[PDB]
Amino acid sequence: VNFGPTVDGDFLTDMPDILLELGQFKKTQILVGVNKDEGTAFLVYGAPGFSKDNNSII
Amino acid sequence: QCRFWTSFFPKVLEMTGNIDEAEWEWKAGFHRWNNYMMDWKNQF
Amino acid sequence: IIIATKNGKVRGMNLTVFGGTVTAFLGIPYAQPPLGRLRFKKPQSLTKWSDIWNATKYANSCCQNIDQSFPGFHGSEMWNPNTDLSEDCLYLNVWIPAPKPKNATVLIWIYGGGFQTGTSSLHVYDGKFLARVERVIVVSMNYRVGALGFLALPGNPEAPGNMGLFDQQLALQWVQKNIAAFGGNPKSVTLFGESAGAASVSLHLLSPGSHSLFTRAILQSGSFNAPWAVTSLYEARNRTLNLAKLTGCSRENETEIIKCLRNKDPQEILLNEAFVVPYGTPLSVNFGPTVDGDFLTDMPDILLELGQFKKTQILVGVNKDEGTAFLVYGAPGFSKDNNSIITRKEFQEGLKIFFPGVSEFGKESILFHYTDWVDDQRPENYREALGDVVGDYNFICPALEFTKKFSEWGNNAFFYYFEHRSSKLPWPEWMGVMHGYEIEFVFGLPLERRDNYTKAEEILSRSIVKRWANFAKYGNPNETQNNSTSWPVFKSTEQKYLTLNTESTRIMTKLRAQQCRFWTSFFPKVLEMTGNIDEAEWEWKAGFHRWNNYMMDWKNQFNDYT
Amino acid sequence: PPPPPPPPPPPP
Ligand SMILES: *[C@@H]1O[C@H](CO)[C@@H](O)[C@H](O)[C@H]1NC(C)=O
Ligand SMILES: *[C@@H]1O[C@H](CO)[C@@H](O)[C@H](O)[C@H]1NC(C)=O
């Protein structure tokens, strides 16, 4: 992330893990989840040996 | 794996490379701290 | 009952065991007494004895320090020697079944004691039981331990190092020379020993002088590739020079050093042995095996890698709780009259005790690696972990890697895991199946109904003795054909081993493979860290995280105090 | 109470 989120002092008054540690957030229910292979897409964007037209044995 | 990433790996990053980002973080901590005079001057 | 040997006739005595008779010859001399000028030298061949020697009592034990940490406690005192100490100690004992066998397989016992202590005259090494039950001949010898066994200035024949090992080898030669007169078969010879006995036998697989005097080998909890087993050549020499300094023998050349050291009392050496190493462990071997150029012509791992050793069958195994014995000998908080619940900080201090020279990241990583709890908070976690740490680091995986590498050259290896806790153990429950407390089972004590063992322990001891005897005779540790669990070979692929307990023996694979994997394939790379940093940013982070959480503590109730 | 104070850093 070349240009991304930061501690601006207004929206974010400190590094977020600290805020998390301190319980300073909206107290409500959340639903969170992930897929098994989130990362595979990125190997063909820089890792040597990988190709979407290969079996990519490295 | 997550036990590794949350409880071992950060301490592995704790050695390689040491530069003024720690002093950046102390600047952040001084900015974290200097507000507490008004919290010292709550009633006093 | 008198047997004529090359050196002369020897008289023995009959003992009544299980309604039968064993003929015992205790304290047969096998070398010239290493006194005066023979002190620190290699062993000299025994010339001849005078008339018939009555070998009807145990000999003097060899000079050693005594465990006195628990006066009157049978658990510790049963391994201390029970006869007088002396430098004239190169003697052996032989137990033969009666009537005399014609071509029996011989078992040779090598005591342990971390190369600093031990003696062949312990009750737990009485070989009358094995002789009675499996009609084989058992021989054991006393060999020099400590500096007297292993003071090293290599190249100098007055004290070349590894003298105790060369004593063992000469004793093997004596067995080759004499066993026929006892009814023995010199072409069916099996060596066995534990913790240092196994290290020694394993070294005889590597030593060219040992290359033709035995057939097979049983290794209980030990091998030369353990970090404490063998000292580097220049660490050994340095230690020798330091002992010389401590005793007032620092001299110009080596022979003046030895001249004054040959005049010192054994007690002076014993009281000075503990200061040659700046930071020792409970398993520290001040004077032990090294690359002497004669016994070891190179570093053992290199010799092992090249397949230059005796190609034969081996039997290897360990006890479930090998590590428990050492925590009560130095770590704070542990006690045989305590339940020894320790904290994380006590654990970390124990880690610093057993691993003095290891970097901070090494300690953090052993700690991390050993705290992946099945269940928490579970109070006994840290205690077992530390015991589990020492054993894993010191014993099972090097023994397994040795087996693996030995089996890669094509020979049959068989591994056991002894899992039964003795009903007569005087130590508390938390110490489990302790180091060294399988030997009494190895020697067959639960077969004796007068000994307060359980029936199940008799059954177990019968089964291990049967499989052992079969391994000795045939190279295969089977028990019976039909209704008996077969003991498969240990192969580097499947890595099958046999569990040993009274409930049921079964075949499992890759015992604690992930932990031992850590110690063989990650841990070596951790001493390569070598990065001494300014430590100020490190200590800054140390204060900084406590700054963070002590800062957290404020607004927990600052919001409330309103 | 008013809380513990911060510690400053040692820089090199
Ligand atoms: C994968 O692709 C690389 C180059 O994109 C190629 O060198 C390699 O041989 C390929 N592997 C295969 C086809 O298995
Ligand atoms: C363990 O033993 C020490 C003495 O060595 C004693 O002070 C301590 O109370 C014991 N800890 C227990 C029983 O948890």
Instruction: Tell me which residue has tokens 């000299």.
Output: C44
Strand partners, C8: C5
Answer for the pair C61, C85: CB distance below 8 angstroms, yes or no. Answer: yes
Beta bridge partners of C319: C418
Contacts of C304 (CB under 8 A, 6+ apart): C206, C225, C402, C405, C406
Kindly list the residues from chain B whose CB atom is less than 8 angstroms away from the CB atom of residue C531: 15
Mutate to test the pocket of ligand 1, among A51, A53, A55, A57 (most ligand atoms within 8 A of CB): A51
Contacts of C504 (CB under 8 A, 6+ apart): none
Report d(CA C152, CA C457) in Å as an integer.
44
Q: Are C132 and C143 in contact (CB under 8 A)?
A: no
**Which two tokens mark C451?**
């000994």
**How many Cβ atoms from other residues are within 10 Å of residue B17's Cβ?**
6
Say how far apart CA C406 and CA C494 lie, in whole Å.
15
Amino acid (one-letter) located at C130? L
Q: How distant is the alpha carbon of residue B5 from its chain centre? A: 19
Residues of B in contact with A14 (CB under 8 A): 28, 32
Can you read off the two tokens belonging to residue C519? 């110690």
Task: Please report which residue ranges of C378-454 form alpha helices under DSSP H.
Answer: 381-391, 397-407, 439-442
| C118 marked as binding residue | no
Question: What type of residue is C550?
Answer: Y
Q: How many CB atoms lie within 10 A of CB C225?
A: 19
Cβ neighbours around B12 below 10 Å, total: 12
Measure in Å the smallest separation between the Cα of B40 and chain D Cα atoms: 6
Whether C281 and C354 have beta carbons less than 8 Å apart is answered as yes
Quick check: helix, strand or coil at residue C318?
Answer: strand
Tell me which residue has its CA closest to atom 10 in ligand 2. C338
Q: Do chains C and A touch (3 or more CB pairs under 8 A)?
A: yes
- Could you give all domains of chain C from N- to C-terminal order, each with its CATH number? 1-526 (3.40.50.1820)
The angle, 0 to 180 degrees and rounded to 10, between the axes of the packed helices B21-33 and C536-552 is 30
Which residues does C471 contact at the CB level (< 8 Å), separation at least 6? C216, C218, C313, C315, C414, C477
Closest CA to C433 of C324, C326, C516: C324
Measure CA of the first residue to CA of the last residue in chain A; give whole Å: 27
Give the distance from residue C510's alpha carbon to the nearest chain A alpha carbon, in angstroms. 28
- Report d(CA B21, CA B37) in Å as an integer: 26
Integer Cα distance of C539 and B16 in angstroms: 15
Q: Is residue C128 within 8 Å of C139, Cβ to Cβ? A: no
Nearest to C312, CA basis, from C397, C188, C165: C188
d(CA C85, CA C87): 7
| Closest chain C residue by Cα to residue D10 | C536
Residues 6+ away with beta carbon under 8 Å from C226 = C199, C394, C395, C398, C399
Residues C159, C292: contact at Cβ < 8 Å?
A: no
Gap between the Cα atoms of C4 and C51, Å rounded: 11
Give the per-residue SS3 of C442-467: HCCHHHCHHHCCCHHHHHHHHHHHHH
> C538 and B14 in contact by Cβ < 8 A?
yes
Tell me whether strands C184-194 and C216-220 are parallel, antiparallel or unpaired. parallel
Peptide bond into C99 cis (omega under 30): yes
Distances (CA, A) of B40 to B33, B36, C549, D4: 11, 6, 19, 12
Instruction: Give the phi and the psi of residue A24 in degrees, each rounded to 5.
Output: -90, 75
Determine whether the interchain pair B36/D3 forms a contact, defined as Cβ–Cβ distance below 8 Å.
Answer: yes
Spatial neighbors of A3 by CB under 8 A, at least 6 apart, are none
Contacts of C364 in chain B (CB under 8 A): 8, 11
Task: Find, in chain C, the residue whose alpha carbon is nearest to that of B18.
Answer: C537
Q: Are C56 and C3 in contact (CB under 8 A)?
A: no
DSSP state, C152? B
Burial class of C419 by CB neighbour count within 10 A (0 to 12, 13 to 18, 19+)? middle
- Tokens representing C260 are 């004054």
Which tokens is A41 given? 């897409």
What resolution in angstrom units was achieved for this structure?
5.7
Question: Do C22 and C128 meet the contact criterion of CB atoms below 8 Å apart?
Answer: yes
Q: Give Cβ neighbours of residue C409 (< 8 Å, ≥ 6 apart).
A: C307, C311
DSSP line for A13-26: SS-HHHHHHTT-S-
Q: Ligand 1, from A50, A54, A55: best to mutate by most atoms within 8 Å of Cβ? A: A54
Q: Write the residue with the smallest CA distance to atom 4 of ligand 1.
A: A49
Pick the catalytic residue from A35, A38, A45, A46: A38
- Do the chains contact at B11 and C537, CB–CB below 8 Å? no
Closest by CA to A6, choosing from B24, C27, C504, C333, is B24
- When computed from its CA atoms, the radius of gyration of chain D, rounded to whole angstroms, is 11
The method recorded for this entry reads cryo-EM
Atom of ligand 1 nearest to the CA of A55: 14
Instruction: Please name the residue of chain D whose CA is at the shortest distance from the CA of residue C554.
Output: D3
A-chain residues within 8 Å CB-CB of C555? 22
Q: Is C435 annotated as a binding residue?
A: yes
Pick the ligand that lies closest to the CA of residue A49. 1
Q: Which of C69, C327, C335, C341 to mutate to test the pocket of ligand 2 (most atoms within 8 A of CB)?
A: C335
* Interchain proximity C364–B32, CB inside 8 Å: no
Hey, whose CA ends up nearest to atom 13 of ligand 1? A54
SS3 category, C315: strand
DSSP string, C503-535: S---EEESTTHHHHHHHHHTGGGGTT-------
User: Does the annotation flag C74 for ligand binding?
Assistant: no
CB nearest B22 (choices: C361, C372, C540): C540
Short-list C162, C213, C228, C217, CA closest to C194: C217
User: Of C72, C43, C51, which is closest to residue C5 (Cα–Cα)?
Assistant: C51
Coil/strand/helix, residue C46 = coil
B32, closest residue in chain A (CA to CA): A14
Compute the C-alpha angle C240/C245/C248, nearest 5°. 120
**Is B32 near chain A, with CB under 8 Å?**
yes
Identify whether A38 is a catalytic site residue.
Answer: yes
**Given an 8 Å threshold on Cβ–Cβ distance, is A22 in contact with C548?**
no
Cα–Cα distance for residue pair C114/C116, rounded to 1 Å: 5
Spatial CB neighbours of C192, under 8 Å, sequence gap ≥ 6: C107, C108, C109, C110, C198, C201, C217, C218, C219, C220
Distance, in Å, from the CA atom of C209 to the CA atom of C43, rounded to the nearest integer, reads: 14
Q: How far apart are CA C515 and CA C395, in angstroms?
A: 12
Going by DSSP bridges, is the β-strand pair C137-141/C91-98 parallel, antiparallel, or unpaired?
A: antiparallel
The token duo for B27 is 């600047």
